[PDB]
Design a protein around this nucleic acid. Structure first.
Length: 161
RNA sequence: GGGGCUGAACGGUUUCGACUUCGAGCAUCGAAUCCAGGGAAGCGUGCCGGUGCAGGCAAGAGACCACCGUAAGCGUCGUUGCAACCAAUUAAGCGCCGAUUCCAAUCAGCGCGACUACGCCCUCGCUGCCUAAGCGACGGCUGGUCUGUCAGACCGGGAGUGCCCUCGGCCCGGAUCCUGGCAUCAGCUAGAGGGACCCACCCACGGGUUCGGUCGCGGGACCUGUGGGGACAUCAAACAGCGACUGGGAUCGUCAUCUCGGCUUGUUCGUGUGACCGGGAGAUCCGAGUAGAGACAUAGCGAACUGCGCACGGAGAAGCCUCGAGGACAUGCCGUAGGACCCGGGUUCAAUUCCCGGCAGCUCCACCA
RNA sequence: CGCGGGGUGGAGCAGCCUGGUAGCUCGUCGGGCUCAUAACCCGAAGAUCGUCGGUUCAAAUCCGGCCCCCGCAACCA
């Protein structure tokens, strides 16, 4: 299963296992991070990151902030603000259906797989929720630090990386 | 220190898909979607009035100030405001630190052992005995200065019944009844009583507010105040406080006809009707009905509109109808056209890749300088 | 002594080949959360560009000199 039976090549660049360990399976959308020509060659060798990330609803557009990019080969590189504002392209037909849901039961927006096509890229968003039900402190302290750690360190070794 | 194997490397590399210029919509967008270089009242109107900005919009306001006879802009004062606005984040809190209470008692343990008003309001003397009134003050024998209790009077009543005869320290008392015989004495100074009363027949008065009223009408004429140690106001005959009889006295009552009265047509009116018409929820002669159970409206014909006084011809916002979709101008959302080929130039779509080449960081060189 | 580069609130970094209103991170001040501190969050203030002189309408920017720092060179008989 590459890209619809046999039509294109899309299998390079692994999937970050952080979203499949602290979240669940419910909603799954597709988007595309607008990047420059420098960030293209910094993700072909499989140099991703496992840092925190959160979206930021602005008017009608989405801005996924807090991201870490390698950009390092042999010597020093001047770079160009790795933690900038990268507008994510989408469809007003989907956006409007996400702002009203992300600002309800305290939901987030974390990426799934990073599909690197012919030079270009394609991020896979998802609308999920944590393993716990809101915050209870006393009633939510023994299941988020014991059972959640097993699902994070157990499912990672099963799917290669 | 200089050239460069490399930084996305047959050119078919518009992610279905974002912005931002275009077709469409105008749903918000300095606006009760617009307005006049337009008209009408015998060619029009008036007897005084307008505008705002020091401070890009708006108020409390003095009627500031002056205009060729023919149209114009202040910042007077006190409050002057918007220049005052405390504008929000994500799923990882058991990691540092916390005292507890009314009857007696207040560091703990042990040996003894319990308090003042609860049953006492309310001086003093004998018992029984409430957890034990330290034989004394309740429930009761008895002993005293302290006076509990069948209580008046505006009953002036036949029928049972004179309903009874003293009061804040008693205005005066325990004599006929609660010492026992023999049916009610701790009120020892606080048992917080229950009271100004409930009218035998007739001395006389009144006849008044229902198509008036009342003397004979249902009332033996009546009701009632009052009188017996001290005196005066009514009845209405079974539909309505707007119900009933032929006749006598009180202040002799009421419904309706014509000369008093109401009007003159979008602003002023000649020229008349006229002191005329109104049987209008207006009086008044006289009659009828049983009453105050009740019912119609004064209009038509044409002289002035500053063109008969002072001025001007859109005088300066008193009202309605006609010419004209006032431009989608004011403005930025929606299906998509377009993608940035390590930042820059040619470029049959994008082009380190097939050409022109600028910087980090790594590989190659013809030297002692 | 030669060449190149560098100086930007308290500090480390933009911007300095194109002279038209100098920004980020951290820290400080003030206002919340907690018993309190730290962490998290926010508002506000703070640098006329090392100094001293020209050109231009306008100089942190172009140019020259002086005072410092850094890299290289400082060396065949």
């Amino acid at each position: 299963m590459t890209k619809k039976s046999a039509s294109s090549n899309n299998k390079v660049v692994a999937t970050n296992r952080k979203a499949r360990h602290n979240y669940t399976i419910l909603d799954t959308y597709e988007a595309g991070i607008v990047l420059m020509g420098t960030e293209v060659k910094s993700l072909r060798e499989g140099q991703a990151s496992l840092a925190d990330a959160f979206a930021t609803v602005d008017d009608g557009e989405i801005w996924l902030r807090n991201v870490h990019i390698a950009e390092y080969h042999h010597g020093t590189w001047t770079n160009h603000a790795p933690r900038r504002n990268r507008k994510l392209l989408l469809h007003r037909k989907q956006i409007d259906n996400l702002i009203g849901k992300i600002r309800d039961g305290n939901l987030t927006l974390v990426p799934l797989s990073i599909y690197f096509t012919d030079g270009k890229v394609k991020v896979e968003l998802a609308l999920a929720r944590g393993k716990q039900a809101h915050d209870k402190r006393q009633d939510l302290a023994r299941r988020d630090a014991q059972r959640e750690v097993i699902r994070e360190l157990g499912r990672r070794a099963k799917g290669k990386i």
